[PDB]
Enzyme design. Structure first.
Site, PDB file in Angstrom:
ATOM      1  N   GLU A 170       0.862  -1.175   0.000  1.00  0.00           N
ATOM      2  CA  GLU A 170       0.000   0.000   0.000  1.00  0.00           C
ATOM      3  C   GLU A 170       0.901   1.228   0.000  1.00  0.00           C
ATOM      4  O   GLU A 170       1.542   1.539   1.009  1.00  0.00           O
ATOM      5  CB  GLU A 170      -0.927  -0.019   1.215  1.00  0.00           C
ATOM      6  CG  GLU A 170      -1.719   1.258   1.455  1.00  0.00           C
ATOM      7  CD  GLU A 170      -2.535   1.195   2.737  1.00  0.00           C
ATOM      8  OE1 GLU A 170      -2.485   0.152   3.419  1.00  0.00           O
ATOM      9  OE2 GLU A 170      -3.225   2.181   3.066  1.00  0.00           O
ATOM     10  N   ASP A 226      -0.898  -0.927   5.636  1.00  0.00           N
ATOM     11  CA  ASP A 226      -0.889  -0.305   6.948  1.00  0.00           C
ATOM     12  C   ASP A 226      -1.812  -1.073   7.889  1.00  0.00           C
ATOM     13  O   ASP A 226      -2.736  -1.774   7.465  1.00  0.00           O
ATOM     14  CB  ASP A 226      -1.343   1.153   6.857  1.00  0.00           C
ATOM     15  CG  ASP A 226      -0.514   1.971   5.881  1.00  0.00           C
ATOM     16  OD1 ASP A 226       0.365   1.396   5.206  1.00  0.00           O
ATOM     17  OD2 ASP A 226      -0.759   3.194   5.781  1.00  0.00           O
ATOM     18  N   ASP A 274      -3.841   0.308   9.960  1.00  0.00           N
ATOM     19  CA  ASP A 274      -5.087   1.025  10.166  1.00  0.00           C
ATOM     20  C   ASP A 274      -6.227   0.310   9.440  1.00  0.00           C
ATOM     21  O   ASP A 274      -6.052  -0.742   8.820  1.00  0.00           O
ATOM     22  CB  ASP A 274      -4.948   2.474   9.703  1.00  0.00           C
ATOM     23  CG  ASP A 274      -4.344   2.597   8.314  1.00  0.00           C
ATOM     24  OD1 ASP A 274      -4.529   1.679   7.487  1.00  0.00           O
ATOM     25  OD2 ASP A 274      -3.683   3.622   8.054  1.00  0.00           O
ATOM     26  N   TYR A 277      -2.363  27.884  -3.982  1.00  0.00           N
ATOM     27  CA  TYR A 277      -2.569  29.220  -4.519  1.00  0.00           C
ATOM     28  C   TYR A 277      -3.862  29.884  -4.051  1.00  0.00           C
ATOM     29  O   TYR A 277      -4.166  30.991  -4.505  1.00  0.00           O
ATOM     30  CB  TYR A 277      -2.509  29.162  -6.047  1.00  0.00           C
ATOM     31  CG  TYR A 277      -1.207  28.560  -6.527  1.00  0.00           C
ATOM     32  CD1 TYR A 277      -0.022  29.283  -6.459  1.00  0.00           C
ATOM     33  CD2 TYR A 277      -1.153  27.260  -7.010  1.00  0.00           C
ATOM     34  CE1 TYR A 277       1.177  28.736  -6.882  1.00  0.00           C
ATOM     35  CE2 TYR A 277       0.042  26.703  -7.436  1.00  0.00           C
ATOM     36  CZ  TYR A 277       1.203  27.447  -7.368  1.00  0.00           C
ATOM     37  OH  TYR A 277       2.395  26.901  -7.789  1.00  0.00           O
TER      38      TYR A 277
HETATM   39 MN    MN Z   1      -2.818   4.166   6.464  1.00  0.00          MN
END
Ligand code: MN
Ligand code: MN
Ligand code: MN
Ligand code: MN
EC number: 5.6.2.2
Lengths: 708, 708
Positions: free
Chosen positions: A26, A106, A108, A351
């Site tokens: 990932e 990850d 998570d 910007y």
């Molecule tokens: Mn993550």
DNA sequence: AGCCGAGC
DNA sequence: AGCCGAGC
């Protein structure tokens, strides 16, 4: 092989192919983490390939979408898969470049989704691989103190380091993970029909209502578990596909609903509410770049997701163009969006600038922060579970979002009609029903049936050959309408011939003007069948899904907007009484402070007591022996969960002057009258004051908007 | 036409071509400014094309460089020019797509350079066009109050608005400029031989020494003009090429030397010194992104140039790798540079961080800021003309830069040898001569002749077939040496056959190790002719140009480093005496403050005076009647260019306590002893203290660097 | 088939 | 022919 992002295993494609493992990662940072983790020796039997993000869900998708997906065909070419090919016989396995796929994501919730979508990818196309253990995963630590995997595992156990993503770990950390792979490698095992039932449950759109019962059980189970005090169950050897879906991927689905579905109270999502708390704490008097503000939001509010999503959340909050925000809480300084392209014309976040609309603190009063519950991330207080606006902002800006198993859609509503309804409920009446109202929308919205509406633009007949379109229905974009409506009318199509002879464009960035030319006969036919139907100026609006988190954090579906208004009203009026109970305590502690400050100074000026040379221990013992209270504000502030007289003794020697005692007595009498005045006000009177101040600035701001 | 960045005139290429004008702009923002300024009607006879920046100087350039320049050939294709073609006869002019070129640039100095380089471009290739007025310019306002062009024109005349670049003006401002073109269009006219003499003077490298006399006259003329009080001459109708070069382009050349050539005092350039002042004012306790710091530098220090140049100035300041900075004033947190590629491997400024080296404030003491002269930009104080380091930083970091007519090059020098030389001069001795020394350079640098040195790496003979290169000469980069030395030795060339059989690379990011294999006979021949000459490990180092701005802002060339050291020493020692004169005044005003604070409190505690009920006017009149001085610090601070006793009367009532009077008398006696102690120190003793503290941290920091 | 947006 | 760097 032709894929530049891929680092191929040396033995991939050879006689050892079945022993090789393809590592799907990932992000490219995890790719570099895994490449250095393998090193020279690991480069032989281990390939590594990145994934851009959430991959295609191939269970239900169009054939063209699947064949046109670059990632799916890259994995197929890398592994050597063939569609519809079942792998059993040794003759079939000879065509595989790799024998295993180890997914590295990850720890998570979003990583678990990519894990599941890859499981959903293999389960659909080649169940011959999935049953036999073709799939593995490489787990990483989320935290260390000496290694912990899931956050519930670390809290039950309790230098501490929190790992955010796979890019946080680097250098020897990556090499340590691949030295011992017995802990960090877990194999997915197929138990039986329970697995297939779990995989299809998550990733199939036929199961949506099943996913509702799926997550409803989990939410009530954890909430009851949280009540009885039982610990949170966690994972992290073999892992069955059923247990992964039910004990892991469900955590992403619940977290997806929590971020994507707004709360009924403030009409916010955790991402948005974190942004507004930051702006509230910064209190910028001048504009700040959206990119810089996003970085400051991440530092102050503990926002753990990517910066790109947060900046667009900010831009989404600042858009004032027709069909977006009836009240934009952030000023759109710079070019945020065009009604033309529907906000997709936004300039880069570096910007453009923003800041708080003057109505922001009027809608979210500052004093009400004392009544909220602020959360904590790793001992850092960040932002409340909700704010408490003076009106149901969820209705004003038309909160919407898409989670797993549920979706929320709301139209906008006029701020003044809502304020009037709140005023009606404050006087004891029933609220008037409300149709959706979009700011500066010149068209019409009328009620068809329950939670169904008809939104229509404006078109007029100028003359026999000419019609004029001055409005498009809400959310229908100028440019889009030109391309998909008028241009097919003008140029004609294969099936349908050309209806209109010509058209011109008078548009203003905030307005729409079309002048269309037709034949006399063809215009007559057009208005015969009706102009709005021919020119596609009517779009149906139906929200039968209104789904919000109530003040208890529970997911509830609301059938009518009047339910949302009533439930908001009871909570907000209850918190207004809490504000009076808090104010009289604060204003009361302040009045006692000014009284004891005045009593002390008046006795020293009259000569009743001399502080000269009095020792600290002697004076403090004397001050408490003479009846002076100890810092009523800090005592009352600490009571909400040695004696301090410093507030008296840190006063300037100027205090003893004739004008400083006179101004102090005036301060003393003014605060007592302030307590007496506010104590005689009803909580409804405080609400009416906040509403009156809001509409005064709302009229000023909106009038300045039109003049500009 | 094939150039996407170009907007062509409608009549360009037709029978009206000679009446058309090509507008060359500086930046694409000025392109959009000019496009909207022309509008629909102006789009006919006016083309607009952007320039990326400073263009090629074609007077002296290689034929291949000219033919390979994309911009030069774009202008040629757009206008329809042909090389060597003279334009006189009507038959020749028929081949031109445009009849005129109007250059549109910013009104700053850099715009005038682009103007001149375009004049230099046409004058060289087609003098047939330049004599007849082929070239025009479009001027813009630099400031308004109602329009002013050059900053000296606005100051002599004296809502005010400063225009930075052409991108600042927008919308109706662009349309207003093109409504009246009589004011904003100025035509370049060829007067005669004076013009050719001026153009070649600026842009030819044969004229370098003439440009020296050119700018030396201007610098002395303006300085004498500044002394006598005469006003600054300014420009802005016809403009001769001579007057443009002498009265305009010279302002860029002087401004180029001022930014590009360091000062002898702090060894800084205006860009760098603005960065360090900002870091000094921010006083960050944690790292900050280089991109964010650059933005903060621009806001605080009034840095008017592009952000890209400023970020690389920051990165240039933070590089600690071999051959760059003996002392890096900014910490390189993140990846700033590799000795491998010579700093060109720097990561993007958004992903790297920096902060002050702990040695920064030790080299530039904070108290010395009171002795500096801080400049002002539009009423905003920014940064001093120079800082005043405890040692000649210009020598330590090897300041260098390239201006117009002059260039400065200095090698580095060891910080400790310099500190020792300063200590020698403090004791009354003569300074030792100094050879250039680069930090962590294991090679040798020896003196050849005056201001000429021999820098050599290290190479050893391991055995008959093997040599080992452990060092490369200063500034010779690892990767570069591999590509241009060892690889041609290994692979051979057309003329030269292969000298070496093989090589390997053991390098560390901070170190260089090469092991080269050769035949026995060919190594013998190599060490016969010598190893350093064969393997190209010796590079000559000669600085005969050392050019610095002295403490008067005058450009001076220094023949020896000992001159720079001596001139720095006299100024720095003079400022150390100024620090003592400032400190005894500040410490003296502080001691008087503590005396009058003690006298007042001691009389109120002894009962000598009672402040109770005394009116403000009565007490202030009584306090001055009793002999108490008025705020000696603010009086002494204001004297450097009603009575205030507040410092006495803002004291806490705690002051009268027994321990607060006791600690106040101790504060009173300690400050008087502090004044008596520092008054007995010589200015040389203060310098030795600053040097001793610097070397203590320098040893600590450099030892921590090696251990890491 | 595609929008809406907070996520990868 | 090309580096060095503060500029466009
Ligand atoms: Mn993550
Ligand atoms: Mn919305
Ligand atoms: Mn400029
Ligand atoms: Mn340098």
């Amino acid at each position: 092989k032709g894929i530049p992002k891929l680092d191929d295993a040396n033995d991939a494609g050879g006689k050892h192919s079945l022993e090789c493992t393809l590592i799907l990662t990932e992000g490219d940072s995890a790719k570099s983490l895994a490449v250095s983790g393998l090193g020279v020796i690991g480069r032989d039997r281990y390939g590594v390939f990145p994934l851009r993000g959430k991959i295609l869900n191939v269970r239900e998708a169009s054939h063209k979408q699947i064949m046109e997906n670059a990632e799916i065909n890259n994995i197929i070419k890398i592994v050597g898969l063939q569609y519809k090919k079942s792998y059993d016989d040794a003759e079939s396995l000879k065509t595989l470049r790799y024998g295993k796929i180890m997914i590295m994501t990850d720890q998570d919730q979003d990583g678990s989704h990519i894990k599941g979508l890859l499981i959903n990818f293999i389960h659909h196309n080649w169940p011959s691989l999935l049953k036999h253990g073709f799939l593995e995963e490489f787990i990483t630590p989320i935290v260390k103190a000496l290694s912990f995997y899931s956050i519930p595992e670390f809290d039950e156990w309790k230098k501490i380091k929190y790992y955010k993503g796979l890019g946080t770990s680097t250098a020897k950390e990556a090499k340590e993970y691949f030295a011992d792979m017995e802990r960090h490698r877990i194999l997915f095992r197929y138990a039986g029909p329970e697995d297939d039932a779990a995989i299809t449950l998550a990733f199939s759109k036929k199961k949506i209502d099943d996913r509702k019962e799926w997550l409803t059980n989990f939410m009530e189970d954890r909430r009851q578990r949280r009540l009885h005090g039982l610990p949170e169950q966690f994972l992290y050897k073999h892992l069955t596909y059923n247990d992964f879906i039910n004990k892991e991927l469900i955590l992403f689905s619940n977290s997806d609903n929590e971020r994507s579905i707004p709360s009924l109270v403030d009409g916010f999502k955790p991402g948005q509410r974190k942004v507004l708390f930051t702006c509230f704490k910064r209190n910028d008097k001048r504009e700040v770049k959206v990119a810089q503000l996003a970085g400051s939001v991440a530092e102050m509010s503990a926002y753990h997701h990517g910066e790109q999503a947060l900046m667009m959340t900010i831009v989404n909050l600042a858009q004032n163009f027709v069909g977006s925000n009836n009240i934009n809480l952030l000023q759109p300084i710079g070019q945020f969006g065009t009604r033309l392209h529907g906000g997709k014309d936004a300039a880069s976040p570096r910007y453009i600038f923003t800041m708080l609309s003057t109505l922001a603190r009027l809608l979210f009063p500052a004093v009400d922060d004392n009544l909220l519950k602020f959360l904590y991330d790793d001992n850092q207080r960040v932002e409340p579970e909700w704010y408490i606006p003076i009106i149901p902002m969820v209705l004003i800006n038309g909160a919407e979002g898409i989670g797993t198993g549920w979706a929320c859609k709301l139209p906008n509503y006029d701020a003044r009609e809502i304020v009037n309804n709140v005023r009606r409920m404050l006087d004891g009446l029933d609220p008037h029903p409300m149709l959706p109202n979009y700011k500066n929308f010149k068209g019409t919205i009328q009620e068809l049936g329950q939670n169904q509406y008809a939104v229509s633009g404006e078109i007029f007949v100028v003359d026999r050959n000419t019609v004029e379109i001055t409005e498009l229905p809400v959310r229908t974009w100028t440019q889009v309408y030109k391309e998909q409506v008028l241009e097919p009318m003008l140029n004609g199509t294969d099936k349908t011939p050309a209806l209109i002879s010509d058209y011109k464009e008078y548009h203003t960035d905030t307005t729409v003007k079309f002048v269309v030319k037709m034949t006399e006969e063809k215009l007559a036919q057009a208005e015969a069948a009706g102009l709005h139907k021919v020119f596609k100026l009517q779009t149906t609006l139906t929200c039968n899904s209104m789904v919000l988190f109530d003040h208890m954090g529970c997911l509830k579906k609301y059938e009518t907007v009047q339910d949302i208004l009533k439930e908001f009203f009871d909570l907000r009026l209850s918190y207004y009484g809490l504000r009076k109970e808090w104010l009289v305590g604060m204003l009361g502690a302040e009045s006692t402070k000014l009284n004891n400050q005045a009593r002390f100074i008046l006795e020293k000026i009259q000569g009743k007591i001399t502080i000269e040379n009095r020792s600290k221990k002697d004076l403090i013992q004397m001050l408490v022996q003479r009846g002076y209270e100890s810092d009523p504000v800090k005592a009352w502030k600490e009571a909400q969960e040695g004696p301090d007289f410093n507030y008296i003794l840190n006063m300037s020697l100027w205090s003893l002057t004739k004008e400083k005692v006179e101004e102090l007595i005036k301060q003393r009498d003014a605060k007592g009258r302030e307590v007496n005045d506010l104590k005689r006000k009803s909580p409804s009177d405080l609400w009416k004051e906040d509403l009156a101040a809001f509409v005064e600035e709302l009229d000023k701001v909106e009038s300045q908007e039109r003049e500009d």
